[PDB]
Amino acid sequence: SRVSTRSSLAEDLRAIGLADGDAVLVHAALRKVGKIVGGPDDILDAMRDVIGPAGTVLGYADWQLEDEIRDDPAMREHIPAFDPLRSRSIRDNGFWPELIRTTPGALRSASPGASMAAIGGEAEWFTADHALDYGYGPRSPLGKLVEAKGKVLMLGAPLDTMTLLAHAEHLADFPNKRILRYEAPILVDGEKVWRWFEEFDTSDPPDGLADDYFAGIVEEFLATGRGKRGKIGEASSVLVPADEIVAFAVDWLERWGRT
Amino acid sequence: SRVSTRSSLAEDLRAIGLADGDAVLVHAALRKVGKIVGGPDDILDAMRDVIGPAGTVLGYADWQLEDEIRDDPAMREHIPAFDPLRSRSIRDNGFWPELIRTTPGALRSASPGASMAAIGGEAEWFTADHALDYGYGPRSPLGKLVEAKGKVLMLGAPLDTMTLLAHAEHLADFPNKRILRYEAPILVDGEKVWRWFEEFDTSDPPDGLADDYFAGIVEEFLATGRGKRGKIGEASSVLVPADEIVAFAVDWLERWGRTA
Numbered sequence: 120s121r122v123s124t125r126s127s128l129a130e131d132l133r134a135i136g137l138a139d140g141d142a143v144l145v146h147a148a149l150r151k152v153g154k155i156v157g158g159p160d161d162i163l164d165a166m167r168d169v170i171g172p173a174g175t176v177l178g179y180a181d182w183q184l185e186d187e188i189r190d191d192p193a194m195r196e197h198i199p200a201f202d203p204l205r206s207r208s209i210r211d212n213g214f215w216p217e218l219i220r221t222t223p224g225a226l227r228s229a230s231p232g233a234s235m236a237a238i239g240g241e242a243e244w245f246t247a248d249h250a251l252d253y254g255y256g257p258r259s260p261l262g263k264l265v266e267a268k269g270k271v272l273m274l275g276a277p278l279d280t281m282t283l284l285a286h287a288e289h290l291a292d293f294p295n296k297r298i299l300r301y302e303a304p305i306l307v308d309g310e311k312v313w314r315w316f317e318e319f320d321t322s323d324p325p326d327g328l329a330d331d332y333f334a335g336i337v338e339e340f341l342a343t344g345r346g347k348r349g350k351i352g353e354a355s356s357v358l359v360p361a362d363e364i365v366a367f368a369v370d371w372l373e374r375w376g377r378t
Numbered sequence: 379s380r381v382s383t384r385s386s387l388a389e390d391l392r393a394i395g396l397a398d399g400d401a402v403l404v405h406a407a408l409r410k411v412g413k414i415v416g417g418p419d420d421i422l423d424a425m426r427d428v429i430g431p432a433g434t435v436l437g438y439a440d441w442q443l444e445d446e447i448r449d450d451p452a453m454r455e456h457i458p459a460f461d462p463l464r465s466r467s468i469r470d471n472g473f474w475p476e477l478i479r480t481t482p483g484a485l486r487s488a489s490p491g492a493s494m495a496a497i498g499g500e501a502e503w504f505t506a507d508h509a510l511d512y513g514y515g516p517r518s519p520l521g522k523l524v525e526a527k528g529k530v531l532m533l534g535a536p537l538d539t540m541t542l543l544a545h546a547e548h549l550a551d552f553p554n555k556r557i558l559r560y561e562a563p564i565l566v567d568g569e570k571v572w573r574w575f576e577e578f579d580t581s582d583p584p585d586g587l588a589d590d591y592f593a594g595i596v597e598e599f600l601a602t603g604r605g606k607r608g609k610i611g612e613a614s615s616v617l618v619p620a621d622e623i624v625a626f627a628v629d630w631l632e633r634w635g636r637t638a
């Protein structure tokens with residue numbers, strides 16, 4: 120139990136594989152890092168030191184609308200619409216996405232449940248044109264992370280929380296993919312509008328698979344030797360390439376689909 | 379089991395005395411408000427609905443640099459400078475100042491430990507020209523709140539967290555006022571420099587007074603029939619005029635200083 124600094128976190132970052140120009144989606148359990156001089160913003164600052172101004176740091180924001188509130192007819196006129204500039208990140212994703220979203224210069228994508236926050240050189244591209252329906256498919260920050268050959272850093276975070284594998288759930292061809300259909304309010308140029316949405320279910324695993332089955336896929340990909348386990352401060356962390364673990368996961372799901 | 383809405387919060391705020399054009403400094407214990415459909419941002423939205431675009435909402439941000447870290451020379455090069463655009467509010471003041479600070483359009487003043495976040499029609503005036511030394515005196519959002527005849531809302535918050543009374547502590551003529559001197563990093567045209575600061579002590583009360591004596595002062599002020607109590611959602615709340623309670627508190631302290 121000793122203090123991390125902005126310079127200290129930068130060298131831990133490089134030791135795990137973070138490099139110049141990297142785009143990296145980060146899932147964090149910030150308590151695992153331990154003591155930090157300047158708070159967790161030192162983590163994001165050290166990240167931008169390593170990747171430089173061309174790199175991008177992302178976080179999975181989502182938003183705070185509860186399903187039972189959304190579907191309560193008495194609540195309709197009182198629910199604030201999703202606003203990429205104002206809607207706060209879902210608390211269950213930890214402070215990290217909210218840390219990014221509230222950093223000046225950061226941007227947030229338009230697809231509510233799948234919304235990502237991004238800061239850095241390509242933050243505008245990663246958050247632009249996010250599909251409202253199927254916000255985990257190719258027209259999403261997750262698809263663009265694969266396209267740009269980005270990475271995913273699990274910063275102390277349990278491996279089941281790697282949202283990128285939901286992009287694999289979208290791409291993979293396996294039978295009986297559940298489809299969700301829901302109505303939610305979104306801000307359309309400043310005005311609240313209720314819009315119907317549809318997507319593949321991301322809150323429940325496919326039938327047969329366990330809730331934390333994302334964790335097993337990550338563990339299998341690391342056994343291939345294409346990842347990197349590393350210590351960020353005091354937090355056991357994993358850095359994996361985005362395109363390689365998506366392909367590994369798509370094949371994993373399609374193979375299971377043929378059983 | 380009651381639920382607050384932006385609409386019902388605006389009714390509660392009008393009922394306690396918030397009005398069109400007000401400037402209100404808010405101290406909040408948001409848990410006491412109870413369930414809110416849109417989360418605590420409904421409170422800020424309802425307030426802006428009541429006071430209108432000419433009104434201003436404020437919160438007491440401070441910042442997160444700890445005294446033990448600040449004074450440890452082994453930490454000196456690693457401490458980030460205070461940046462009114464990036465330094466997060468001290469967590470001890472609750473989510474409310476950070477809620478305001480991170481709302482687009484909000485501004486945050488320059489005097490680190492005394493810094494305030496503000497949003498609304500006069501947020502720029504309230505946060506401008508905040509004195510680095512004696513940041514609770516006349517050149518501060520607290521002084522400007524008195525000047526603008528603003529209000530203070532304790533939103534479920536304990537009455538001793540009324541930071542406006544530190545402005546009265548600054549003005550009050552009583553003997554042996556403790557003066558604090560400390561060094562802290564700030565940005566001067568976008569570059570970190572360490573600067574020495576001076577102010578009257580706000581982390582400890584005057585010698586002989588309890589740590590929570592602010593609360594007694596507010597209660598004594600309400601005992602005169604000025605101010606107003608009411609429920610904001612489920613939160614027992616207090617709205618007082620800024621100028622009247624400062625004059626009351628300065629009188630209270632100066633009369634106390636003449637005893638013993």
Ligand SMILES: CN[C@@H]1[C@@H](O)[C@@H](O[C@@H]2[C@@H](O)[C@H](O[C@H]3O[C@H](CN)CC[C@H]3N)[C@@H](NSCCNC(=O)CCNC(=O)[C@H](O)C(C)(C)COP(=O)(O)OP(=O)(O)OC[C@H]3O[C@@H](n4cnc5c(N)ncnc54)[C@H](O)[C@@H]3OP(=O)(O)O)C[C@H]2N)OC[C@]1(C)O
Pocket residue numbers: 146147148149150151158159179181182183184185186209211212213214215231232233276277279280281282285321322323330331442466469476
């Ligand atoms: C419409 N909304 C959704 C919709 O989008 C859709 O949602 C899906 C969702 O349901 C799925 O969930 C399913 O799968 C998940 C994963 N298996 C489990 C639930 C299950 N139903 C979802 N799968 S994706 C999950 C993505 N999650 C993450 O990225 C988070 C990863 N992190 C962790 O898991 C951590 O373990 C965490 C839980 C966050 C707790 O860690 P910890 O508390 O230790 O650390 P934390 O990060 O919280 O920070 C603490 C320290 O931070 C410092 N701090 C905080 N604030 C500070 C401030 N202001 N200043 C300075 N410092 C600060 C501080 O040091 C803190 O420590 P301290 O407090 O001092 O002690 C896919 C989804 N799409 O369907 C459902 C909905 C509802 O419709």
Ligand SMILES: CN[C@@H]1[C@@H](O)[C@@H](O[C@@H]2[C@@H](O)[C@H](O[C@H]3O[C@H](CN)CC[C@H]3N)[C@@H](NSCCNC(=O)CCNC(=O)[C@H](O)C(C)(C)COP(=O)(O)OP(=O)(O)OC[C@H]3O[C@@H](n4cnc5c(N)ncnc54)[C@H](O)[C@@H]3OP(=O)(O)O)C[C@H]2N)OC[C@]1(C)O
Pocket residue numbers: 207210217405406407408409410417418438440441442443444445468470471472473474490491492535536538539540541580581582589590
């Ligand atoms: C350099 N820094 C300082 C320096 O400035 C100087 O500081 C002075 C300081 O030392 C003095 O302290 C002295 O006096 C104080 C007051 N008597 C006591 C200590 C003493 N030494 C100081 N005096 S003034 C203090 C001003 N304080 C306030 O304004 C706070 C008022 N509120 C309260 O007190 C509450 O009781 C509180 C503590 C906040 C707890 O309330 P609560 O539990 O209800 O928490 P919160 O309000 O945050 O609400 C939580 C809910 O909010 C929702 N939420 C949160 N986050 C959300 C997100 N992301 N999304 C959506 N919703 C969110 C949610 O519902 C939460 O609830 P849940 O978690 O879900 O259950 C003067 C100072 N100048 O000297 C010291 C230093 C260090 O040098």
Ligand SMILES: [Cl-]
Pocket residue numbers: 198199200311
């Ligand atoms: Cl709205």
Ligand SMILES: [Cl-]
Pocket residue numbers: 409410
């Ligand atoms: Cl409480």
